[PDB]
Every structure is written in C-alpha cells, then in structure tokens.
Design a protein around this nucleic acid. Structure first.
Ligand SMILES: [Mg+2]
Ligand SMILES: [Mg+2]
Ligand SMILES: [Zn+2]
Lengths: 38, 136, 130, 135, 362
RNA sequence: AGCCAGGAUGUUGGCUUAGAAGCAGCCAUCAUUUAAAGAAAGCGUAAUAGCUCACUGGUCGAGUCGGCCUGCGCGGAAGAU
C-alpha cells in the first residue's frame, strides 16, 4: 500500500476506484501497484 | 543557470508583478508552455525545467527558453537584524505574468512535446499550460 | 477504417463474385497460420493473385453484397466462415482442397458447406471436371 | 513436440561449445542428432549453418525436415565482409547491388513463403538494409 | 617480393615467440576442459559459476583460434609465394599480399591485448629515476639511465618533459622526474620500474677500481585527480545544543553549539565558537569536510603502504637488469635476454628488452 | 465492453557481448503470406523457451469514446488543559 497525495494508474491492469470517499488504485496483476490517497 | 553577463546596476527594487504578459504567442517553435499563473521563475528553476524537457525530447528537436532571469533578488544573511543597508544578491528571477510563453519547442511529435512540457511544468512554481502555433 | 474504404472493399468483393461462379469455404476456429499461408501459395501456383480468403462474413458486409449475386449466401453469414472466389475454368478443383486441408489438422470448423454451385448439399462432391 | 531451431555450422560435427545442453535437453541422445546433421550435410555444402525441425517423439526416433540456410550469412558471403553493422547510417560499411540480391532470392525459393520472386528479393533487400549495407 | 618474403619469415618467428610467452598448449588444454564442463547440463544450475566459466572460455578460444589462423595463413601465403614468383600471376600475388597483411594485423592485435591488458596501460606516465648508495658513480649511472630513457622515448615518438631534476654535486644527477606523454606510454614503460645494476671501472675513483653501482627507475601513471565529492545531508546527523560555561541569560537558553556526525563512518565535528548557530554549523561543516578529506587521504596511504610492503617482499628481485661494461654484456634478470652491444643499449636500444618483458607479463 | 479464434515468414536482422534469439544495449525499423500479425508495448529467461499485448476475423445488437470550456464538491490536511 503506497499512500500518496497523487495516485495514478501505473499499468493497464491498475484501476482507480473510490471507496468510502477515498481514491484508490487497485491492481489485479501487481500487488506493488495498489495505492491510496492520504 | 541563466544570468545577465553585465549589469547596469548590481541590486534592484522589489517592484510589483501585476498585468498580463507580452511574449504571449508561440513565435519560434511549434509548441509552447504558456504560464497561466502569476509568479517569478528563478534561474535555477528555469534550468531545471530545461533539463527535464531536453531529456524527455532525447536531444531531438529544438528548444527555446523565451524567459530570462534578469532581475536580481537580494537576501539578507541569517541572524542579521533589519537595518544596515540592502542584502546581497543571491539569485536571479524572471518575473512571470499570466500569458507568458516560457518555453518553445519544434522538431517533435505533438504528444511527445506535451509530455515533455508536463515534465517541465512540475519543476516550475507557476501553473502552466500547453499551447500551439497559431496562424495569426 | 472509414466508410469509403469499406464500400470500395465491398465493391471489389462484388466484382470478384461476378467474375467467378464456383466457391468454397474454410474456417480458423483452431487453425495454424502456416497452413493458411501454404493454402494461399497453392492458389498462386495454380493461377493469378485474384483469390483471397476474404474474412468479412458479417451480418451486413458480405451479406449486404449478397443481394447482388448468389442470394442464398445470406444464410451462411451468422457463422465464422471464409469464402473463396474462383475465376478461371468451369468448376475448378479447389473445393476438395479445403476438405483435404481440414482433414490435415483444422478440427472441423467450417463443416464444408459447399457454397452451392450446382445447388449442392452439405456433403462433398468429388465429381468435378478435370 | 519440443521443436526448437538451435544449431551452428554444418561442417562442425557434434556442436559441443555453442549448443551443448540445448540439443540434449530432451530424451534424445547427443550422438544421434549430430549423425543426422552429418547425413544431411553431405548432399549439399559445408561451413554454413542449417536449421532443422526437432520433433522429439516419445519413441526417441525424431522426425526432421531441413530448412534453407540463414539469409544473413549468405548476404555476408555475397558481400565479402565479416562485420558491417556498427553505425550504418552514420557511415556505410558495405554495399550490395539489386541483381545480386535477386540472384540470392531465387535459390531459397522452396522454404520462402510466397509465389512472387520479386517479393522475396525485396524482403532480402530489407534484410540487407537492416544489417547495415546500403542497396 | 624479397621484402615480403622477409616479412613472412619474421612473422612465423614472432608467432612462435608469442606462443612461448603465452604457454599455448596449457591454454588449449584449459579451453578443452572448460568446454567439457560447459556441455554438462548440471553446470548451469549454479549460475555464478557458469557465467564465470563462460567468460574464461571465450578469451581462451580467441587466443587459440587466432594462433592457428596465424599458422595457416602464413602457410597459405608461402604456397602462393611460389605462384607469384614462377607462374608470374599478378592478381593472385596481390591477393596473397593482402592476406598476409591481414594476418599481420591480426597478430599485432593479439600481441597488443596480451601486452596492454592492464587498466592504466594506455595513459601517460611519470618516470622517476633515483641514484643509489654509491655516491658520484651512482649519480653518474643514474644520469646515464635517464639519458637512455630519453633516447628511447624520442625513438618511438613520446614527448619527454623534465619536471624535477636534482643535480649531482660532482657529476651526473642525484634524482630526476620525467613526464612522458604519448599513446600507451605507461604500458610501454611500466616494466622498467626496478633497480638497475651498473658494473664498470669507476672514472671518479682515484684507485680506478671496478664498481657495482645501483640506481632505481620508478614508473607510475598520471592518474586523473578525482573531484572531492560533496557529502549528502542524508548521510549526516546535525545535533544542536547548549554551550559549556556559556555566561549570561541568553546563552543559557540559546542552542548555538553544533555537532555534525557522519552516519556511514562515525566521525563527529563539534563547533561552538560563534554566537550564531548558523555560523557554527558552517564552521562545523567545513571541519567535517576537512576530516573526511583527511580520512580519504589516510585510506589512500594505507593501501599504498600495503602495495610497497608487497613490493618489498620481493627484495633482491627488484633488480631487473645487469649492465656489465667490463665484460661487455647486458642481461635482463626477469626474462633472461642477453646482448653484447652495451653501447647501443645505452644509446637507446631498449625495444629488445621491453617488448620481451611485456610478452612475459612481468 | 465482454466473449471465441489467429497473433506468422526471411528471422534468432546484425553486432558487442560472457550470452543477447521482439525485450542488456547500439542501430536499421524493411519487405513477405495478407483477414491481420511491431525486426515488437508489457511479463518472463542463464539465454532460448514460455505467458500476454498491438492490429484483425467471428459472436453480440445500441449508443459509445476522450479532450475542451465552466459551476459546485473530494483527497492532499498531524500538536500539545
Ligand atoms: Mg511589461
Ligand atoms: Mg480542499
Ligand atoms: Zn498495476
């Protein structure tokens, strides 16, 4: 979990989703890629 | 790091930075990075931006730096009281008004140029925008 | 690709059909490229460049050019299929070629429908002018 | 079934240094492949590499079908040069005529995928260009 | 075509010499064993080993392959030489000549790599000549050596420059430093480091006795003086605290004193000279930098000390040549090459020694 | 947008490299069989192999794509009774 101010799609498999009013990158392929805005 | 070779005067008044810019259009290149925000680019900052963009363009196509840091900014040394004359010149700025084409570029595909400009932009203190060559 | 190019392609297809009466089918629902290449080369060996396998059997592509010539070909549409227009010679022997190809590893995709030239059935016709 | 093209020159019987574990990765022995290669060789020419299909069956006795020798080596031979790739557009190392390329094309026709020899010629020209030699 | 023939004759000889120096058969054997190891599929399970073995193999192969190419090419040329001579076909002769030239070039390349395999071999050098324990005689010997070296350097095309010269009070020189600029200057000269043995009847001795005087040559390459790198604030801990004794109300409160610490090394610098914390930090920073520099110097010195200690270990083996002028014979102790033309050697015919030394790898 | 299929040939382009086979780079970036297939976008390898992708054929049967302009919001946002 990379908590950042800027969250970005790092690959094709990265998807940006909003969960309970928090922007999140979740990725099916790469576990490293998953992010959270904080 | 850009700086005037010679100067008429070693120090300078603060002044104000109000108004719109004059170097507004893409003149030389095909694409430009136009300043949307008001502020002041230091020489250092400009250089950084140039470095960012050249690398991005991989030494292919020409770059112009439409801005020049011709105004010296003084800083008083630390732990020194308020009197006793003006501080020494530390760094040089270009005062930037909205509308200022900061950088110009040609001999590049458009997307790549855009990318380069974006890369540059993060190095600069002011909010900026990509612009193109306009007939008239 | 834009509308014009598609239209042109359709026109070309129509012209090809007009030129050649006999036709046959093939399908790549599990087909190697090498085999296809070889098949193509066979055509070249035989006669001119004219013949293409023309994979464009959509509901409104080849089926839209079907009302021009050979009107029964509209029902062939809703399946993965590839046509083969045959210009020179009255009833050539490229129909059984496809069957042979199928036999040599293709896993029965086209089901050799025939394209009906003398109003033929689903089963093969070995009886052909030689 | 375990088919891979990996071999050096035809004259070099039993490729020990370059191929090595690659040829004898599967159940088939070292000596057999080499013998097969030798058998293939005597009909045509030595010195050049020749690729062959390696269908490793469960019975060990593999089926093999030969291919035409690589184009690059042939091109090199035609040229009379050994190295001509280092900075090609900066400075032209070697040069070939179209006729020679055409001649080269015709001999390989069996393995080349196509009917038109002109096509083959142009492919060969492209290959040459890629290598570094200007037509 | 007589010169061509001569060249051909020479080339075989030098190939043989090269083989001798290399120890070719052993190399071939090594290549073979390594090759055998390679094909065994179990060796690529261990990756570090395998890559190393591969690396070892290739160079050996190159060495071997080039060698027999040389053997074959020469033979081919000889075969074609006859054709050139008797049959009088010109094109064929030309072709043969070209082949020979190519072969020669290849040989040179192989020899080049054998010679100048070291890191600093391409660079220019400072030759340092020091006179021995003898006295006037020793000084004279040193001077002679210097002269010889100069002559040698001029011969091949190097640029000599007398940096420092300590002159002998009676005759000759006490010491000399010569900068020798040129292509592969250090690589050509690095072998000449060592003590030189003069044996002659002294002209400075009143008795006219036969003296054995020594003088050392020392060749070292001009290393690029690396910039003293700026230390990062990430590698640094900056502590700030109150001063000792202090003396007043403002001093008790204010934390002017600065302790800078290097995290990787563990060096500390304290400063509390100034009232201003910033100034102290600046001073402390400077001090830290100085300390780092000193540490770097110390480390350099230690390594250097190790090196000479190792060199010292050889002792009497630092004696590289013996210049006997009475019996009229020069001998290199390292290689074993001898010549009776002493005067010629003195004048500057060192190529015969130097090349052989390079080939040897000593 | 899913889904089913192909995703080749010269070819492993040469070089320089310990090895380099789309993927260490350096460089050219062609042509072929053509439905379409980059001398290759990512994963992967000792390197090959292998797994994806681009583009394309089939199914399906109505809107869809991503820029610009602006309004209002979200995160970025931690302190001591
Ligand atoms: Mg103004
Ligand atoms: Mg906010
Ligand atoms: Zn991802």
């Amino acid at each position: 979990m990379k908590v950042r101010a800027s969250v970005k799609k790092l690959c094709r498999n990265c998807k940006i989703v909003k969960r309970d009013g928090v922007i999140r990158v979740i990725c099916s392929a790469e576990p490293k890629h998953k992010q959270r805005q904080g | 790091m850009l700086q005037p070779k010679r100067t008429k005067f070693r120090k300078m008044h603060k002044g104000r930075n109000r108004g719109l810019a004059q170097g507004t259009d893409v003149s030389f290149g095909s694409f430009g990075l136009k300043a949307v925000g008001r502020g002041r680019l230091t020489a250092r900052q400009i250089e950084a931006a140039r470095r960012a963009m050249t690398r991005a363009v991989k030494r292919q196509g020409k770059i112009w730096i439409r801005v020049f840091p011709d105004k010296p900014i003084t800083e008083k040394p630390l732990a020194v009281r308020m009197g006793k004359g003006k501080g020494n010149v530390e760094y040089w700025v270009a005062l930037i008004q909205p509308g200022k084409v900061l950088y110009e570029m040609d001999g590049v595909p458009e997307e790549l140029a855009r990318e380069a400009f974006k890369l540059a932009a993060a190095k600069l203190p002011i909010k900026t925008t990509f612009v193109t060559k306009t007939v008239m | 690709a834009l509308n014009l190019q598609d239209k042109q392609a359709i026109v070309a297809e129509v012209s090809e059909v007009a030129k050649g009466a006999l036709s046959a089918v093939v399908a790549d629902s599990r087909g190697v490229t090498v085999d296809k290449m070889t098949e193509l080369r066979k055509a070249g060996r035989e006669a001119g460049v004219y013949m293409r396998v023309v994979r464009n059997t959509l509901l409104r592509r080849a089926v839209e050019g079907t009302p021009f010539e050979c009107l029964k070909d509209a029902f062939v549409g809703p399946t993965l299929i590839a046509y083969s227009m045959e210009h020179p010679g009255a009833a050539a022997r490229l129909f059984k070629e496809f069957a042979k190809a199928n036999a040599k590893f293709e896993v029965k995709a086209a089901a050799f429908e025939g394209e009906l030239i003398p109003a033929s059935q689903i089963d093969r016709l070995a009886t052909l002018p030689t | 079934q375990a088919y891979v093209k990996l071999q050096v020159a035809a004259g070099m019987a039993n490729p020990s240094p370059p191929v090595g574990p690659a040829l004898g990765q599967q159940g088939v022995n070292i000596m057999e492949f080499c013998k097969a290669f030798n058998a293939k060789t005597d009909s045509i020419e030595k010195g050049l590499p020749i690729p062959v299909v390696i269908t490793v069956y469960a019975d060990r006795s593999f089926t093999f079908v030969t291919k035409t020798p690589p184009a690059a080596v042939l091109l090199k031979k035609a040229a009379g040069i050994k190295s001509g790739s280092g900075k090609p557009n900066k400075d032209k190392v070697g040069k070939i005529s179209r006729a020679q390329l055409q001649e080269i094309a015709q001999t390989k026709a069996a393995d080349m995928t196509g009917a038109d020899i002109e096509a083959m010629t142009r492919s060969i020209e492209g290959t040459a260009r890629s290598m570094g030699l200007v037509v | 075509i007589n010169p061509v023939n001569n060249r051909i004759q020479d080339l075989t000889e030098r190939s043989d010499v090269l083989r001798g120096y290399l120890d070719y058969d052993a190399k071939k054997e090594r290549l073979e064993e390594v090759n055998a190891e390679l094909e065994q599929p179990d060796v690529w399970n261990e990756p570090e080993r395998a890559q190393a073995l591969g690396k070892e193999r290739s160079s050996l192969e190159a060495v071997v392959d080039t060698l027999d190419q040389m053997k074959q090419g020469l033979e081919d040329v000889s075969g074609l030489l006859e054709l050139a001579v008797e049959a009088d076909d010109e094109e064929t002769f030309n072709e043969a000549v070209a082949e020979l030239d190519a072969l020669e070039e290849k040989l040179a390349q192989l020899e080049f790599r054998r010679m100048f395999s070291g890191e600093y071999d391409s660079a220019d050098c400072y030759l340092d000549i020091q006179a021995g324990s003898g006295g006037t005689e020793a000084q004279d010997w040193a001077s002679m050596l210097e002269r010889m070296y100069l002559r040698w350097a001029e011969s091949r095309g190097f640029k000599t420059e007398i940096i420092e010269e300590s002159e002998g009070e009676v005759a000759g020189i006490k010491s000399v430093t010569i900068k020798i600029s040129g292509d592969y200057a250090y690589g050509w000269l690095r072998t000449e480091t060592g003590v030189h043995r003069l044996v002659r009847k002294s002209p400075f001795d009143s008795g006219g006795r036969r003296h054995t005087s020594f003088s050392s040559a020392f060749v070292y390459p001009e290393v690029d003086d690396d910039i003293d790198i700026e230390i990062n604030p990430a590698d640094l801990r900056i502590d700030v605290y109150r001063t000792s004794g202090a003396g007043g109300q403002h001093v008790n409160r204010t934390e002017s004193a600065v302790r800078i610490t290097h995290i990787p090394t563990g060096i500390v610098t304290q400063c509390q000279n100034d009232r201003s914390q910033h100034k102290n930090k600046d001073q402390a920073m400077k001090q830290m930098k100085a300390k780092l520099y000193e540490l770097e110097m110390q480390k350099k010195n230690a390594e250097k000390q190790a090196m000479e200690d190792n060199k010292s270990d050889i002792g009497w083996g630092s004696q590289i040549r013996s210049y006997v002028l009475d019996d009229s014979r020069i001998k290199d102790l390292r290689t074993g090459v001898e010549t009776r033309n002493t005067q010629a050697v003195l004048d500057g015919s060192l190529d015969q020694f130097i090349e052989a030394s390079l080939k040897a790898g000593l």
